[PDB]
Amino acid sequence: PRSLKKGPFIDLHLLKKVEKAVESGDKKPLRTWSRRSTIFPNMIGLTIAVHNGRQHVPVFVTDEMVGHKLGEFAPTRTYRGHAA
Amino acid sequence: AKLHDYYKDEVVKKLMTEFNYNSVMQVPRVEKITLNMGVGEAIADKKLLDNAAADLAAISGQKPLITKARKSVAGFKIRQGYPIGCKVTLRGERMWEFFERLITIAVPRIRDFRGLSAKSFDGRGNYSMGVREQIIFPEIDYDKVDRVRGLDITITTTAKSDEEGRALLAAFDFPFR
Amino acid sequence: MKKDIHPKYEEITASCSCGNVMKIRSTVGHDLNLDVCSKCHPFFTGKQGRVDRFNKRFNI
Amino acid sequence: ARIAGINIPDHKHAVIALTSIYGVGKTRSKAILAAAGIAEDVKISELSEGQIDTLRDEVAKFVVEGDLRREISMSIKRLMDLGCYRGLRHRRGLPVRGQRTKTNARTRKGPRKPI
RNA sequence: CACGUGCUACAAUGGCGCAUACAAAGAGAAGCGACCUCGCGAGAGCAAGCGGACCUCAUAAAGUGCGUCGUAGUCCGGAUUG
Numbered sequence: 190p191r192s193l194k195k196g197p198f199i200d201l202h203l204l205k206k207v208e209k210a211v212e213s214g215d216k217k218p219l220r221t222w223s224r225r226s227t228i229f230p231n232m233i234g235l236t237i238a239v240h241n242g243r244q245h246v247p248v249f250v251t252d253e254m255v256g257h258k259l260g261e262f263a264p265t266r267t268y269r270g271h272a273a
Numbered sequence: 274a275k276l277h278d279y280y281k282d283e284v285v286k287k288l289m290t291e292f293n294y295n296s297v298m299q300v301p302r303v304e305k306i307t308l309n310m311g312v313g314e315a316i317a318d319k320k321l322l323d324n325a326a327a328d329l330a331a332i333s334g335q336k337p338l339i340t341k342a343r344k345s346v347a348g349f350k351i352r353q354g355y356p357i358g359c360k361v362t363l364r365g366e367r368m369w370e371f372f373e374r375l376i377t378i379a380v381p382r383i384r385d386f387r388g389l390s391a392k393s394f395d396g397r398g399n400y401s402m403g404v405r406e407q408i409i410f411p412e413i414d415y416d417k418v419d420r421v422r423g424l425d426i427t428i429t430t431t432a433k434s435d436e437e438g439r440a441l442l443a444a445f446d447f448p449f450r
Numbered sequence: 451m452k453k454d455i456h457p458k459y460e461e462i463t464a465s466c467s468c469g470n471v472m473k474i475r476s477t478v479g480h481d482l483n484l485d486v487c488s489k490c491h492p493f494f495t496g497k498q499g500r501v502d503r504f505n506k507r508f509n510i
Numbered sequence: 511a512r513i514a515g516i517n518i519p520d521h522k523h524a525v526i527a528l529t530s531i532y533g534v535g536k537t538r539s540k541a542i543l544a545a546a547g548i549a550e551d552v553k554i555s556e557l558s559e560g561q562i563d564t565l566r567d568e569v570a571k572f573v574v575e576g577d578l579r580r581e582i583s584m585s586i587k588r589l590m591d592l593g594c595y596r597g598l599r600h601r602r603g604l605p606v607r608g609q610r611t612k613t614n615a616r617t618r619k620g621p622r623k624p625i
Numbered sequence: 626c627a628c629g630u631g632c633u634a635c636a637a638u639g640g641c642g643c644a645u646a647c648a649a650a651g652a653g654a655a656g657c658g659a660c661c662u663c664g665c666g667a668g669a670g671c672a673a674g675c676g677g678a679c680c681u682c683a684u685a686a687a688g689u690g691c692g693u694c695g696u697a698g699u700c701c702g703g704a705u706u707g
């Protein structure tokens with residue numbers, strides 16, 4: 190995991206968007222490709238659509254989700270089982 | 274003895290106030306405690322039932338009564354009159370001594386004890402609980418235990434309802450989650 | 451009680467770490483030393499997130 | 511003899527015997543013994559009841575047995591409820607730490623299941 | 626799910642603890658980095674030396690002595706998961 194001294198990593202563009210959305214009010218889901226960005230407390234109650242490589246997957250941030258990367262909640266590979 | 278003395282000295286007064294009972298006879302009493310072991314494995318081996326009986330005897334302090342199948346059951350591969358369990362009925366002094374031992378020593382010795390369910394009343398004020406391991410009872414020796422045997426304990430009460438039953442047990446500070 | 455069919459049942463002294471001593475009838479016969487009892491057991495005594503975690507670890 | 515609601519082996523040395531407790535490994539076992547002032551080589555049978563009580567106090571400091579199991583269960587449950595990648599791996603009974611699944615992964619998957 | 630090539634084991638000709646011997650070959654400047662301090666540790670800070678038979682990587686390990694474990698799914702194994 191990222192060293193504590195470096196602090197949590199977030200893409201600047203996502204941070205700006207989140208701040209604007211929080212200030213604005215309840216907003217349409219934010220569309221981001223930043224799967225690597227850590228989920229922050231301010232994000233809670235916001236819906237962020239995270240790219241999974243082919244589509245943006247809506248994620249409603251919750252308190253438990255905080256401290257996890259956005260990509261964790263958007264699955265990249267599709268598998269419905271062999272011989273299914 | 275002590276718990277019986279406690280019942281008369283304290284429990285009656287607390288219950289009388291709580292339920293506004295007209296008479297002392299109205300106050301719920303612990304009629305009996307029945308300890309049962311269902312030894313299905315006995316059908317394969319007779320000795321297992323004997324060992325279970327010996328364990329129940331040590332815990333109860335009383336020789337157990339062997340129970341036998343009421344009717345033949347294909348599912349369990351049992352025929353009527355085949356011994357498949359043992360029980361002891363505890364009354365009076367022996368009951369109160371067991372009740373004390375259970376609350377004071379055995380229940381604490383239960384692994385990962387987080388309290389007993391208060392929803393285990395049968396609807397008529399009688400409380401049933403299961404013991405997963407005979408080890409909890411101090412009389413049983415961990416070193417000499419051939420097999421882990423559980424038992425089911427039922428406390429029969431003169432309580433008309435579950436609320437009266439739970440109150441009676443609560444008065445004795447029976448552990449409840 | 452019937453005679454000669456029951457286990458011997460005599461008063462024994464049970465001692466605990468908390469120091470509670472109880473004299474009870476039992477088939478055990480020998481005096482018992484107990485790790486725990488009703489008096490000292492945590493349940494009886496009553497002795498028995500992410501947002502906060504984030505703030506503590508990553509306070510800026 | 512009886513610590514943390516379990517029976518530790520009397521014949522074994524204390525350092526080994528303590529590891530029988532869930533949540534106690536060799537390191538914690540050594541730490542507990544050092545705090546209790548009991549030598550690692552000493553057998554549990556040899557220890558006095560007072561010595562056993564000191565051990566019990568030391569064990570109480572660490573989360574162990576049922577309490578630990580509850581914590582572990584909650585942590586896994588949280589992940590599965592979250593629906594995070596790790597949670598999904600727990601649900602499917604597949605490796606959670608990015609190991610290969612094309613071959614191996616038998617510990618998580620279990621015995622090979624013929625097509 | 627099937628196969629190939631490996632690694633680690635299933636222990637006592639071993640495991641673990643402590644103490645203590647004996648190599649070769651090689652690499653290094655957006656590099657090798659000592660010492661000292663700090664951290665259980667991975668490391669961190671500070672900071673020599675060395676473009677090298679000079680300084681650094683860098684500890685050889687098996688071994689040996691002593692102690693312990695005593696044939697157990699173990700003081701074997703170290704997968705898996707928090």
Ligand SMILES: [K+]
Binds near residue numbers: 530
């Ligand atoms: K352990």
Ligand SMILES: [K+]
Binds near residue numbers: 608609610611
């Ligand atoms: K993978």
Ligand SMILES: [K+]
Binds near residue numbers: 631632
């Ligand atoms: K390999």
Ligand SMILES: [Zn+2]
Binds near residue numbers: 469485487490491
């Ligand atoms: Zn006590």
